[PDB]
Each structure stands twice: as structure tokens, then as C-alpha cells.
Amino acid sequence: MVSKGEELFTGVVPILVELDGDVNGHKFSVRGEGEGDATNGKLTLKFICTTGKLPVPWPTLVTTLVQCFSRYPDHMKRHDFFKSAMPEGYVQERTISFKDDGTYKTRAEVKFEGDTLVNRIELKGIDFKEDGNILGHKLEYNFNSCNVYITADKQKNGIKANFKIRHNVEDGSVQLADHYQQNTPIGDGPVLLPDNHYLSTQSFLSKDPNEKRDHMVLLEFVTAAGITHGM
Amino acid sequence: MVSKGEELFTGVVPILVELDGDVNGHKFSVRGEGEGDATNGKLTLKFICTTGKLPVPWPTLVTTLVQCFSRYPDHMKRHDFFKSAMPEGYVQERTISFKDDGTYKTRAEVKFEGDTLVNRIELKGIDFKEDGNILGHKLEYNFNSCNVYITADKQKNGIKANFKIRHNVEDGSVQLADHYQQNTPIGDGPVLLPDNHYLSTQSFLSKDPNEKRDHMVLLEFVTAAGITHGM
């Protein structure tokens, strides 16, 4: 039984991402466009800094810049909160604590505006070191993680996640980014509260050789796993 | 340019797996049947121990029981050795060293026999402890890993991999299984030697409630990543 939220994702869906950021008083905007193919768990986006030089490394923004495009295998569809909240969508909040450096706090609404899945984000960054790995642009241009665990919000409709991102630093050290995440449905419609499970994400960060603006080309594959009940 | 080996995988392909095993002199056979969908990197197999009780835990056999069904994204197809060797196929050899316990040595041929992709394996296990985690059946019925790195065989046509599998033990400890892998093409036809990359595998192990024989139902999703050149 393909749920109504699920039905919105059965084809290729256009994506718009808008981020307005302030890190230590550096104002920037990022705009991304592309498409999501939830059936294959495939994301293809190109992000532009529309205000000039991005004052943080692109890799620090990957997690902030649409978990509704996760490939949930058939036997796990009952645990897909992200599509069940659509089209009205969900609020996604994070604290991202960079070890020995500053903090990002993000608030986003992920929802349909007509035929497009929109992720509209506000980001505030404080306590960054002027010559640390983030404001100093010392992070390698890549992105790796090994499973983000998703859990039901146990006081209310929604999900939570906490996970650690390891950013390679150019000197061969590692910059830790501890993520705390809470998602709440925007509407009052029924949603699916999941059992514990995880999302596995592979990421490819490249450049468009003809693009002069500061930018990130991003390809992702995402698959849910960690529940075997009901197959 | 869809290579001829690639073309053999564009649909759903039937799979046959045959394993003849000897662990500490316990003779067993495993037979598996199902299908591979390389376009989605999806494997669905059911394995039977045709000789009675499997004398090792099913999870210890998952890696031995067809990397040609990996989803290689478009920009990485030139690095897919496993399909390039088809239909004549490849020899896949492993040593699997169980920490504080015995060793498996495996030799398999992965090739097409008519319309079916066949994995035919010989397994020899020695130096197992009669009451260790393997012959004692103390391993949880599940399977997790975080990336297997694939490299070109640098003296000859083929690939190598070494990776560590962590099997959960029922007391809450961990049984390490260190895998060393070498694959060689069976034919003399051109093959693709890859740049360094990895395979990401999600695994679901269940039971058929109507199956009385010792068995494992296995669903897998596999995606290649770790190269961004040429997108």
C-alpha cells in the first residue's frame, strides 16, 4: 500500500535549496537546484554561493543542504517519516558542534511548493576561530560518513538523529563535527513514527569547470537499513 | 558506452550459489538461488544447508556466498572489474582469519552458465575452537560493515581487497574476521583495472517461517563510491 506521501516521490522530483547564513558575522547565501529520485535514493544538485566567496568550506554545509529522497526498501516503508510528512513537510533543526571551534545552529523547512521539494534554511555560526580549519579553509573537498541512526521522537511526532562527521584536514588531521538533529511535522496529518534504523549515504563532491562562481556539484546515493521485520 | 560485460547485467539476472565446505572435518553443502539487479545494486537470495545443520554461523558465510551485482554509478563504470570479466568470469580467493579462532580459505569461480550467474565455492576451515564463537554458534544473526576498499592487482589483471568484518557475539563482545581477497579473470579478454574505490553494502538476514531446513534469507544493496573523476 503506497502511502500518499510516498506517491509524491515515485518519479524524478525537482529540488530547490535556499540557505541564508551568518558565521561570525560573515553573511552569505547559497542556492542549489537539481533533482531527487527516491526510488534510486539518488540526489544530483549544484550549489552556488550567490554572495561571492563562501566563508566556510563546502563540506561543512553538506548535511545542512532532504532525507525524504532516501531509498527505503519495501519491507521498511512503514518507517519512512520523511515522505509521510509530505506535502506539508517537516522542520529540521540541528546543532553542529565543530570540536575546538564554533557551532552552527540550523532551522529548515522541507516541504513541497508546487511540484518542487524545497529545503529553506537559516544557519547561524558563532565562536569560530579566524584561522581555524573552518574560517581558514583547511578542509579537504570531500565527504564520508558510516551510517546515521534515526530514532522516533519519544515525546512527540517526529525523528531525532545524532551522528559525528569526520572532515579530513589538509595537514592529514581530522576535524570532528558532532550533529544533533530533531525533525517535526509541519502539518497535523498522520505520520509514520519509525523503529530504530539508519541511513547510509555515499557523496561525490566535484566542480563545474565552466562555473566561475564559488560552487559545489554534489551527487549522493542514500539507502535505509537496520530493520529486517516484515520481509 | 555500455561495455559488453555491463550489458549482461542491465536486467534481473538469476543467481545460483553452490558452496562445498569442510570446517575442522565437518562436511557441509550450501545451495542458494535468487536474482541480482545490478542497476539497483540489489541481491535477493535464499540459502539452504542441504546436508543438515550448518556447522558454522550463517553470518560467517555472507562474504563467501557476487560483487558483479554492485551498482557502479555512471561516472565510475570504467572502474567495474567484476562485470568487465563476464561472461567468462573471475576466480575469487579469500583467507578469512577469525581472531583467537580458526581460518577459512575459499576458492570460487564467478561466471555465467547460460543465463545464470554462478558462484561455485570450495571452503576449508581449520584450527577452529570446538566451543569458540564459530563452532559454538555464539554469533548474532545479522551482518554490518562500513566500506570494502577495492584496489587493482598491481602485478597482474585483477583486484584485491582486505577488510575487517565485526560479528556481534551473543554475550555483547565482538568476533573479528580479517578478510584478504584476490580476484583474477578466467579469460584472456580485455578487462577494466580500477583506480582505488570502495563498495558500500547493506545486508538483511531473515528466516522463511515455512522453511524447516537450516537456511538464510538475504537481501543486499551495494553501491560503489570513492572516485569523483569524470562527472
Residue numbers in the entry:
A (entry chain A), B (entry chain A): 0 to 64, 68 to 233
Paper text:
By incorporating a cysteine at residue 148 together with a mutation that stabilises the dimer interface, we engineered sfGFP to switch to a highly fluorescent “on” dimeric state. Structures of the monomeric and dimeric GFP-diS2 suggest that charge switching is through peptide bond flipping and the formation of a buried organised water network around the chromophore that spans the interface region.
The two dimers have a defined, symmetrical interface comprising the same residues from each monomer unit covering 910 Å2 (as defined by PISA44). The introduction of the V206F mutation plays an important role in promoting the dimer formation as it makes interactions with 6 residues in the neighbouring monomer, including a pi–cation interaction with H77. Together with W1, the W2 and W3 water molecules form a H-bond network to the CRO with these waters being in the same plane as the CRO. W4 and W5 are above the plane of the CRO and occupy the space available due to rearrangement of the C148–N149 peptide bond; they form a H-bond network with S147. In the broader picture of the dimer, waters W1, W2 and W3 form a long-range polar network that spans the dimer interface incorporating Y200 from the second protomer. Crucially, these water molecules are also largely buried at the dimer interface thus restricting their exchange with bulk solvent.
